[PDB]
Structure 1
């Protein structure tokens, strides 16, 4: 129980994140294999992903707490395998929509991995496991992305070979998940315990941070691609550097020894202010011969977010019950998604306060600044009442 538990958990987190062809799904659909039109992919496929994610997060976090997290991790792996099988053996648009449902199912089961790494270790080791596994996962993503780009830049393999490699890696990840140790009204009980746990201050603070900062981080990450496109290899370089720095910062977060009873709100306020500054750097840096500054700003922003995430998960779990952690994570993620949607309704789409990408990033920076000011006020209130 000494080596294999944590080492194999980190190894599975790394390998389950290896999908070289996941960054080239869109071109593969538009390439000379699927022959899908651009409208078809943009309208009938990705909105399916978003809607299915929103409708699938709820059962996932309602059930992963009960069935233990190993079945849900196996389900995530099998859904990734099904996604690539549909990619390699799907001609109609309905097959691709089913693939997007399965991809949303995969995206909804990360809370299972987090709560699983948390349920296998003594609470005194909550932080380090939070720092290690997350880092590994991010490292995996890094490797995945890099691998894909390398296999399409230095190598001459087609998208079909890349998808076959991704399917083989997904099968290996499923085999790895098969050997994971399974830990050893009901809904009314769970809701009452959730409320009682939310009465605790640390859980409130870190769940609020999750809900109102993961949404902003996902908005910035998703919209920075089109922000840079509006103004190729450099895009991948920035993405890979940000992922690697995120893994490094999660690893570092595993090792920090900050007194969280008093210096938790301050830390969140400072990091959120830094993220607001970095988003403003991403937005207002319109000088064409300055893209290194924009890339550095994005890399540092992702590094800060992936530094704060393991701390958030560890402090949420340490102030929770046994069969609650996954549920809480899911709810936060669920709420985060909703928040993001709300913002992406009021800033980009459905008329609303419609603005270009630069103005959207300015509003995201102002949103992060508002959060930072709110958290600074909270820290001042905590200090004044002490």
Structure 2
């Protein structure tokens, strides 16, 4: 088991996030194969996915740590297979709502796999394993996106044959997941553990970083595609994913003194993200779109550089074997913050503003987050 703890785990992550037909779900639901209603794919499947994400995350993060991370990893593949079987069979919109529910089910085994790595390896290579696995995950996402875009734009095969390839790769991912080794008032136990671990400085900082910076990252990523909506969009996404994989690898390889040079790093990367968001918002010249794409890929790399470090620091600082619960509560809070900000600002009944203004307030949001982190770094060090 000298390779099947890191090398095989990273290979499984790479093979699990290979779904060439995942980005083409909406066109497939709109093409001649499975002709649907334009409003149905908007008011019937997107809302059910959005609500079921939280409704499924709530028990997943509670149960994955107790289940020892193997059942949830297998359930990810089984639910992806169910999603694609529903996509292939199709039938009525009830099947599509079931497909979106199963997709929301898959969305939380992300946190399951993220917490698996630190329960697989010893608490001395957490950073190098977090970087390896995040790099493998982002490489898998990039390979899936490239595979899909190459098959449709170049190979022009179909939206069904691409889905068959996706089904084959998902079944192989399930086969791989079956061979992963299983690590060896519970509600009150978890509540007491969280109450005791919140007081730690390294868990609290990276927990408050996850629930806010990631929520800002989701908001920017979602609103970039709204602004974008083209070959120069999927290409930008693939470049951003490759840069994210490379930066996750670097984070798994970087060796600095943490708990002293940590809040400064967070503040610096957040300020860089705020600058890139400002550049994205304040650039509309016709001969400047490549600069916008470069800003997007740099923002994605900046965010994905900290995710392995955040996971390693949340796992290392924990004194109990339930890193899955902390990862899940952070992801749940990030999604809740994103939903709250969208409802408060983006809603028509709320302070409804165009996409450019949306990026202006998100630029100032990243700015104030960076300012708060820099102020924390200037107030903790001043109390040396």
**Hey, what does 1:254 align to over in structure 2?**
252
**Hey, what does 2:382 align to over in structure 1?**
384
**Hey, what does 1:354 align to over in structure 2?**
352
Structure 1 residue 4: Cα displacement: 1.5
1:147-197 residue CA offsets vs partner (Å, 9 max, x unmatched): 000000110211000000000000000000000000011110111011111
CA distance in 1, matches of 2:321, 2:254: 27
Quick check: 1:79–1:103 contact (8 Å CA) kept in 2?
yes
**Hey, what does 1:338 align to over in structure 2?**
336
**Hey, what does 2:140 align to over in structure 1?**
140
Correspondence 1:137-286 to 2 at 5 A: 137-229=137-229, 232-286=230-284
Give 3-state SS (helix, strand or coil) of 1:323's partner: coil
CA distance in 2, matches of 1:369, 1:156: 43
Quick check: 2:346–2:352 contact (8 Å CA) kept in 1?
yes
CA distance in 1, matches of 2:158, 2:349: 40
Structure 1 residue 322: Cα displacement: 3.4
Query: Which of the residues 361, 365, 368 maps onto 1:363?
Result: 361
CA distance in 1, matches of 2:332, 2:226: 25
1:287-332 residue CA offsets vs partner (Å, 9 max, x unmatched): 1110011000000000000001000000000010332200000000
CA distance in 2, matches of 1:156, 1:130: 37
Structure 1 residue 345: Cα displacement: 1.1
**Hey, what does 1:37 align to over in structure 2?**
37
Q: Give the TM-score, by structure 2 length.
A: 0.99
Quick check: 1:347–1:354 contact (8 Å CA) kept in 2?
yes
Gaps of 5+ in 2: none
**Hey, what does 2:18 align to over in structure 1?**
18
CA distance in 2, matches of 1:130, 1:254: 6
Gaps of 5+ in 1: none
Quick check: 2:66–2:322 contact (8 Å CA) kept in 1?
no
Give 3-state SS (helix, strand or coil) of 2:23's partner: helix
1:117-147 residue CA offsets vs partner (Å, 9 max, x unmatched): 1101111100000000000000000000000
Quick check: 2:117–2:129 contact (8 Å CA) kept in 1?
yes
CA distance in 1, matches of 2:73, 2:241: 22
CA distance in 1, matches of 2:194, 2:317: 11
Quick check: 2:21–2:166 contact (8 Å CA) kept in 1?
yes
CA distance in 1, matches of 2:298, 2:46: 28
Q: Name the Cα RMSD after superposition.
A: 0.7
Quick check: 1:194–1:324 contact (8 Å CA) kept in 2?
no
CA distance in 2, matches of 1:255, 1:220: 27
**Hey, what does 1:93 align to over in structure 2?**
93
CA distance in 2, matches of 1:91, 1:282: 41
Structure 1 residue 349: Cα displacement: 1.9
1:231-281 residue CA offsets vs partner (Å, 9 max, x unmatched): x00001100000000000000000111211111111100100100010111
Structure 1 residue 205: Cα displacement: 0.2
Structure 1 residue 347: Cα displacement: 2.2
CA distance in 2, matches of 1:99, 1:183: 30
Give 3-state SS (helix, strand or coil) of 1:182's partner: coil
Quick check: 1:279–1:361 contact (8 Å CA) kept in 2?
yes
Give 3-state SS (helix, strand or coil) of 2:55's partner: helix
CA distance in 1, matches of 2:32, 2:330: 41
1:174-224 residue CA offsets vs partner (Å, 9 max, x unmatched): 000000000011110111011111110000000000000110101111110
CA distance in 1, matches of 2:228, 2:288: 12
